[PDB]
């Protein structure tokens, strides 16, 4: 029984989103690849390089025109005619647009594809631009975070495959299932926040008791993600649980909302 074709492309990136994906605990990334999808193109993992990789890209988008999911990791830079990100000697944006035209839907992985992330932070030397500002005629599911939670990535894939539909989304295109509520709306340190029980300097007595990280700059109160509920790395931890405030890493422009340690 045929698996749904997925084309996974990479713009300006650090590869944290592919790395997060392979961390998936349930389903294992192994089983996603072998049983749930047909991961037909993916620079980081695929055997073919160069002309062999170009042949795969061209064949898949042609053969499965209108029928593949396009996963995008990273983003296109508009600076230097797009040649801050070069693929087969040409601007990355050309491949983005070619792949987008044939896709049934697009997943914008991470803060990079969703919003811009670190390369888009002031002064944005490359004019890094999120996917939805370039591709304007396709369904785009934003799955933000730097990177998103591994089991959130795999859960979204499983939903799309199993239910044969896109996740319902908020007004910004984020799946309601995992981005409907704030970190601070499900944080296990809220008792401390409500009591005015705060860490005031690192490794103080408050810190050693798991007090709230608000005064240490936690951006949980303005950040939508699943970290405080689903947690990270098979439920082992999340930023706040290990003693650092939320950076705000799932939110548009988080790098430029001031010091991580200020209000």
């Amino acid at each position: 029984k045929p698996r749904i074709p997925v084309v996974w492309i990479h713009g300006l990136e650090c590869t944290c989103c592919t790395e997060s994906f392979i961390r998936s605990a349930h389903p294992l990334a192994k089983d996603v690849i072998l049983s749930l999808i047909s991961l037909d193109y993916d620079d980081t993992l695929m055997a073919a390089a160069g002309t062999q990789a170009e042949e795969v890209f061209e064949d898949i988008i042609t053969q499965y025109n209108g029928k593949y999911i396009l996963a995008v990791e990273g983003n296109p830079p508009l600076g230097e005619q797009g040649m801050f990100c070069i693929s087969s000697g040409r601007p990355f944006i050309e491949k983005l647009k070619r792949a987008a035209a044939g896709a049934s839907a697009i997943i914008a992985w991470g803060t990079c594809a969703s919003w811009g992330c670190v390369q888009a932070a002031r002064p944005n030397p490359t004019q890094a631009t999120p996917i939805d500002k370039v591709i304007t005629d396709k369904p785009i599911i934003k799955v933000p975070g730097c990177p998103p939670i591994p089991d959130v990535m795999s859960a979204i894939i499983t939903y799309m495959v199993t239910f044969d539909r896109l996740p319902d989304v908020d007004r910004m295109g984020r799946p309601l299932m995992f981005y409907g509520q704030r970190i601070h709306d499900k944080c296990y340190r809220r008792a401390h926040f409500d009591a005015g029980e705060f860490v005031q300097s690192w490794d103080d007595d408050a810190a050693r008791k798991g007090y709230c990280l608000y005064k240490m700059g936690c951006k949980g109160p303005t950040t939508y993600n699943a970290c405080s509920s689903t947690r990270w790395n098979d439920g082992v931890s999340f930023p706040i649980q290990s003693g650092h405030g939320c950076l705000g890493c799932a939110e548009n422009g988080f790098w430029d909302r001031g010091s991580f340690y200020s209000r």
Binding site: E19, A25, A47, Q52, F84, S88, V118, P125, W202, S259
Partner: protein
């Protein structure tokens, strides 16, 4: 076409030009071009980084305490190593000393990264260069079991297991949906494993894909999450509480038990799966001990890493030795100083950057990151590179040199430095490994050698994880819980002007961050990263970097199928987002 001599090589751009763009099974974006002569031997090699983001620019005007978070996103593969370098650099500038447990935990973070990164590289990135996945469909499962059992005590070796793996692969490919195996190099004559070794390798590919997820649970405990854990200037934020009220809110005995469980499993996987597989690749591909030497018999560089005495970055403290060898003189390992302006310099005469004088190299404290996309005549257009012009600017990667010498960095480099400094564990490991392969020492200075050294490093790091964990537990038993120094957290306590260097050995080699602070903000932040060294373009003297050199003189069986190029490039574990930042 032209020809010139450099570093013992004849750089000749006559003959057929081959382009490999994109290079896959790397991190990020790379292009490679070669020229081959009438004997299909490479006489010219061109390394090109095909991405840039500009973290050095973005970091200007940030708070130094925030810097680690930004630069961590230089790379999601070597995740955490830039955060470590950053906190080291800021602490070095301000004059901050962290508590012992912070240093130990930072060492745990780095060893965990080494283990994870090296494992994924072996299987998911380099592996398909050596393992013919489709040829596994021809294997006898019983002969596969027999092979595995001859090489390892690893439990998962049953004939039924290998039959089930083979059947899974058979069902996967049967519909034509080959996914990551589509249009591969399968059947290429340089694939030398027998079918049973291919099935064993493939099975382990899948096992490693599963198991790698567990290793990073250590980063989740101390660092909140992986990829991209959290850190602080002054130590780590993962406050410890073993025996007091509220230990549920901190790193407690249960959290430490989790870490211990991961360490043991990580060592067992590396020692009984990866190590034997690396030796087997060696046994079946011995000719690759003589291919891709490049600079590894000439110039190698390590800064050193894993300071065991907290806040002491000296030779007596670093568990992973630093040093430089030049001109093939391994009898004189030279000391490296990252403040010395005559040592590390970067050139941009062959890169897409502006300097006031592109004929001189700039030490990172004098560094400039002024992007200038200027490819000149590339037989197409500015937006259509058909052939890079290696006589002018051809890369987003700067060209680092050490005392003007082009250097190789990474696991092989480090092994050679430690070996020739007389590190006992390294000498014994290397000697035994090359003995087992029936190869001379010189066989390590090769594409095969890079792979062997990387595996052996994964084993070293898994050992060090336990050592560091035990060190942590010793402190906790003695009631020493501190994880942060905050005496100089507040900007009002900092020097008005200061600068610092943070350095370490990332999975791919020598890493440095150079930071200048003024008036509470980052004035300058310059990174030179391992793949910057290895993937370097040329300099004003025409000297070639590690990748170009290692590709030189290489035979290709089938020019249109660049398996030999991939093998050598992948052996260095290229991280292009790192290289360019």
């Amino acid at each position: 076409s032209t020809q010139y001599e450099t570093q013992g090589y004849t750089i000749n751009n006559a003959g057929r030009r081959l382009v490999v763009d994109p290079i896959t099974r790397i991190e990020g974006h790379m292009r490679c071009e070669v020229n081959i002569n009438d004997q299909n031997v490479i006489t010219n090699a061109v390394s090109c980084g095909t991405m840039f983001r500009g973290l050095e620019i973005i970091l200007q005007g940030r708070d130094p305490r925030d810097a680690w978070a930004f630069v961590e996103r230089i790379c999601g593969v070597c995740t955490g190593v830039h955060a470590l370098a950053s906190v080291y650099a800021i602490e070095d500038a301000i004059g901050i000393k962290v508590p012992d447990n912070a240093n130990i935990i930072r060492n745990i973070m780095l060893a965990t990264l080494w283990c994870h990164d090296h494992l994924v590289h072996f299987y998911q990135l380099a592996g398909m260069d050596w393992i013919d996945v489709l040829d596994a469909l021809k294997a006898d499962p019983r002969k596969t079991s027999e092979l595995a059992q001859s090489l390892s005590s690893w439990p998962k070796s049953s004939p039924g297991y290998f039959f089930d793996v083979q059947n899974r692969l058979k069902k996967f490919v049967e519909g034509g949906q080959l996914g990551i195996f589509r249009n591969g190099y399968w059947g290429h004559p340089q694939y030398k494993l027998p079918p049973e070794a291919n099935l064993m390798g493939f099975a382990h590919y899948l096992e490693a894909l599963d198991f790698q997820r567990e290793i990073v649970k250590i980063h989740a405990v101390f660092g909140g999450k992986n990829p991209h854990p959290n850190w602080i200037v002054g130590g780590m934020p993962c406050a410890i509480n073993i025996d007091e009220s509220g230990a549920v809110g901190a790193v407690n005995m249960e959290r430490l038990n989790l870490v211990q469980s991961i360490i043991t499993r990580t060592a067992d996987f590396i020692n009984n799966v990866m190590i034997p597989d690396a030796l087997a690749i060696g046994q079946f591909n011995k000719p690759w001990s003589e291919i891709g030497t490049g600079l590894s018999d000439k110039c190698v560089l390590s800064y050193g890493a894993f300071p065991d005495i907290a806040n002491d970055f000296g030779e007596k403290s670093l568990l992973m030795p630093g040093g430089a060898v030049i001109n093939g003189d391994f009898n004189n390992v030279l000391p490296v100083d990252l403040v010395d302006p005559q040592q590390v310099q970067e050139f941009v005469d062959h890169a897409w950057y502006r300097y006031p004088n592109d004929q001189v190299g700039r030490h990172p404290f004098d560094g400039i990151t002024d992007p200038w996309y200027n490819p000149g005549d590339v037989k197409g257009s500015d937006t259509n590179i058909q052939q890079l012009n290696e006589q002018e600017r051809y890369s987003w990667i700067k060209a680092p040199r050490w005392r003007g010498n082009a250097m190789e960095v990474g696991p092989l480099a480090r092994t050679l430095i430690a070996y020739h400094k007389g590190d006992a564990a390294t000498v014994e490991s290397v000697d035994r490994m090359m003995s087992a392969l029936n190869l001379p020492l010189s066989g390590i200075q090769s594409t095969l050698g890079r792979i062997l050294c990387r595996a052996h490093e994964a084993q070293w790091a898994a050992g060090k994880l336990q050592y560091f964990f035990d060190k942590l537990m010793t402190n906790l038993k003695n009631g020493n819980l501190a994880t942060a120094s905050t005496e100089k957290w507040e900007p009002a306590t900092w020097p008005t002007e200061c600068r610092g260097v943070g350095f370490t050995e990332a999975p791919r080699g020598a890493l440095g961050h150079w930071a200048a602070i003024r008036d509470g903000k980052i004035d300058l932040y310059q990174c030179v990263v391992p793949t910057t060294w290895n993937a370097s373009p040329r300099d004003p003297k025409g000297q070639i970097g590690a990748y170009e050199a290692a590709l030189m003189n290489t035979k290709m069986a089938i020019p249109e199928q660049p398996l030999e190029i991939l093998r050598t490039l992948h052996s260095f574990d290229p991280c292009l987002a790192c290289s360019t930042h």
